[PDB]
Symmetry: T
């Protein structure tokens, strides 16, 4: 039912870094409604704020779709907060992080996530939602 | 319209390594029909045979969804055949290859692929199909 | 006399990640009183806030007992703030950080700390207090 | 005309870590006036706040002189915000970061910066200003 | 009740390498009595002799406080003997082994030990005793 | 008063590798006069000749501004000659050596230099002169 | 009862690369009969064919003695097929693979095998058979 | 007299990956006739087939000119087959394999080959033929 | 005729670390008699004692079967003593040392040994004896 | 028409390090005449002199065949001079530099060269000439 | 006056591993007498015994000439004992340890020794004695 | 009889970098006369000049004592010239090159030299002479 979509540093800049972050929210919220879900979309440049949203999902046992931006590669604290989630965690990157700098090919999140989607654009979010909708059966 | 789904070594063993490879074919072909696509699903344990199917997709300019199994980590020849594709190439792994041995966290295919889906089970294939259906607009 | 105990990201979650962070505060404050000390215990998920508490200890020349959580492994800025302390700095980890992932076996703090205690549970804090009480003689 | 000088974690402590951060501001603002520029000097220990000031410079197409302190070595998110700048970005370190610990000899910022000045003291800032003044001709 | 304190190569030289090894024994034995324990303190420069004392602790299921000196960094055989202990094993270093040569920052013992204390001087031994006294409850 | 500017291999080719090496000399000598200095500018493709000019600066206790070209990355002998200088040594690169090949991001000179300027064009030389002029006070 | 002996690339060349591959088959089949076993010996230069023989042993729950030749060092796909075996897998090399090139000292098979024999010549096969005969008791 | 030219995976695609593989055969066979040689040109995407052609050259003691494509970088089995050749082995790459990805700069074949030609286009084959013609004297 | 079986540190603990070291001796001595050999079995936790037994085998030109325990991974001195043996040296490990910690996958002994057996239990010793019995012909 | 053949350190010693450097010059000059070219052959042990000959080829836009001897592996300055050539640059080694020490398998020149010939003896020079003659058509 | 010459594991085997260890003692003792010194020569295969002889030299402030055999490369404990010497410590190897295996090119002793002699045979000892005789002046 | 002592870059600066290079020559020439030798001492900052002196020693089959200064660590060309010497080559460093920067602990010369002396001051030269005098017997 409730799915949390959390975006990390710089993702507020989408469209100027053409879909904007507001349009992304709209797209996600339409998809989720079609799927029978309710998406809660949040973005912050602040690690502490991302931690607090992860903590809340942990306490509520709600899935998470996380695009942690550069913190993917660098934050053990984020990793550790994510390891507490009991529900599914799907890591998303809009670009293909394996076609860029070598340092972007290591993620602290992937090993603890249920799965990862990269390179498929903003549609990656939508596809993550669909996994979570079809992974509510038994 | 036509999408090629190619499975590499050991993927014929699905279900005993519970969905079998035949059931996977059936699932993919139903999804593709719903999406308005036609999926051609092939599996081989032979690198040379996988190369030939990639070559054919290159000549036809048809997208590919590739689960290369262990060859993901080891074959430069497969990589090189894939670099010739002009249409989208989506790399899929059923399990989360970042939660296993360290050697599975390097892929020769990811850098040249449009994107990658891992850890989402057999549904990863279906989600790759949906990207390709929504990425036929302009 | 005054000792600062500072806890970093995720340590507010103790007990659910059975002793809670409030119980830890209580335990530390009882020990410190028995030892003739006054413990000031603070926790934050925010690097900037941890920096400010370190800066204050530097200006006051008061010892610090620091459990920096994941920032131990990743923050040069925290390290650098800690290098300004003139009083003792004791690094504490509740779990044995050498029995986990390889990345947890490198600390930016250990080289600049007076000493380090790991693996001894919440009692590590209490033992750090006792060092500081017996290291006030000449 | 407008140049942004942004200082990262611990730089507020200058003089006690003998020129203070206020004196640095004064020195920069006098130099800039002599050069015909207007310097806006900001300092924060908070990554999110540094990101926001970088974002603003990106939107305004104004140059930046950045001393990111320890975040130089560790933040991909800062790097990524900086990659959006269209105007010049000059990385400054007061000390010679190549004469210290080995870990300080890798910067995530240098590859994306116009240039870098290290080891020349607070005068590094002033010299960065002069580059920007003479790099306004055609 | 019985705790074994075992010191490895060069620790017989304490005080001239100002507390001597005899004074250390005395200090440990007074602390242990205060705690209600009985400490058995042994030192040898001989790996085979250290192995035999570890084997005996294994057979008796008695805790160990071990300062293995240079063998910490180099002996797989010592590690392997220690892995047989069922009771707690606390690794102690008098100096901060992370503030010295890089090679001293890897220990074969830490991963298999209950916990580790470094940098706190001879008081590290005493603090290890206190852990073991308070870790005899249920 | 006297400052030595020494250029290493290939720097004689400036402008064709648009400012030529003669124009650089002229620019440096005008700046230096404005600053009250006297610049002596030399260029050679010969390591032995660069060594001899460094030796002379060492004997005279005169500062050096050095652009060692490729020898920056490869010559321990140059490094060692430079370590004898008692006056300031400022390393200069016209391009940003951190935005190119990985091998150019290690310099044998930086650790022993007072500071380093890279990426600021030929103006880097001029800025190095200004440091040296303002670093003649007490 | 049935044991599979599978030889990989180049092993058909034994004797000319003095025992030939046919003589090896004969030697193995005589030993196995003496032991009360039935050995099925197969050799191929084709990875896909080796995979198929491993798959068959997996389905039948029969032990395997495998000399994978160069594929030992390079094939993740072979490894993965072997991980499905429930019966014992004994890796054999005729020469001592640790006395040659460094690259031959890493095997993808050893970690998943029951055990490994190297350097003992063709007798290694025979000794592997004897393990399997004495490892059929309870 | 007889020289074998063997091409590995993907080389059948020459011209579309403008000279085609058939034209290459024609060019090689004309050159060889001019030189007094007889060239036998073979191409396969199958490692096992390449092995068999190498084995045949070994048994006949005929030289080989080998373009192993991606298998250059990855196959120990190919290497090992090649080590059996008594006649000259010349490794050829049409492109400069040192101007591409880092992984292409290591070859398992070069150390065992007589020599290597890269970057000289299809003419590399022809030049390899000429070496072999002039290396038939005493 | 005479074969030396030497066991290193911790191997005296077999059965409690269910076959004991005495039972191993008995098993080896029965096998050897069946084979027409005489086995001399020795175990020590002391490197110097192992060295002396290796030296004696060197002087007598008698084969050795060596299980050096942790010293396999760490002792150059043991290696060097073993390099003097003229008769066969067979390295044995009871467990599969490639299925454990990464550090156990490097042996100083393997490169100088005739061959190695790992993972086959105590039967590895017996199989080593059989090699030595069948390797006494011409 | 004009091709420059430049030989680096130690190549003057050919024949005693049986063809001498004078005979090499003669062989090259005969080949070049047969091909319709004019070869200018130079050798020096001095990096600065090699640089000057490269600079001259750059200014004249003439091809170069370069055997830089040990400087291949070590000189960034030589590399950088070579990067200025607009005409073809063919790297030659007489021996197979991949069959020797590991350090000889990295070249600073190969990535910037048109192609490389190694292991083919002095005939490598002659083959490089032939490439350049047939690469003068359109 | 008194110089200690200490030999480590395997050095008792000199001559059979043609000068024997007794002849070495004789040679050293004749040289030392000629120089006006008194040499005390000791050899052991036991680390603990070598430690005790180093400890004694430390307490007496007598120089040491040490050939630690394989322990050079592996013992931190030996290193640490040696760091206590106040008089000169000269490391000797009879063979050139840089012309052998790569692992022999790292010594734990060299960094703490006054100097090192390798490759000069048994005469290395004699030359070490001569240094110590001429290094007794002021 | 004739021994060549060759000094590389910066060694002309001895005494100011208290024995000067002229005094070193005098000391060497007195020692050599006492030993019955004739020493020829040369120093240059020029690699090409050092090469020429090595070449001459090669042609004459005369020993060499070489202090190559920084070129020890960096020149493959020097190494290669030295490999041609048939007479002994003794590498000398005045300081202990293993007690300084890590990069000084790798020498291109040591593996090809007869032996090496470091850390023994200018007396190292004299001791090298004595080896060569006593290594003229049979």
């Amino acid at each position: 039912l409730i799915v949390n979509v959390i975006n990390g540093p710089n993702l507020g800049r989408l469209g100027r870094r053409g879909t904007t972050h507001d349009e992304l929210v709209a797209l996600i919220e339409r998809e989720a409604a079609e799927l029978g879900l309710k998406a809660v979309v949040r973005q912050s440049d602040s690690e502490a704020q991302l931690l607090d949203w992860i903590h809340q999902a942990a306490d509520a046992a709600e899935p998470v779709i996380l695009n942690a931006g550069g913190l993917t590669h660098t934050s053990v604290a984020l990793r550790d907060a994510c390891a507490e989630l009991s529900a599914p965690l799907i890591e998303v990157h809009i670009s293909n992080v394996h076609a860029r700098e070598e340092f972007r090919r290591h993620s602290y999140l992937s090993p603890i996530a249920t799965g990862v989607i990269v390179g498929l654009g903003i549609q990656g979010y939508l596809l993550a939602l669909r996994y979570l909708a079809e992974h509510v059966g038994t």
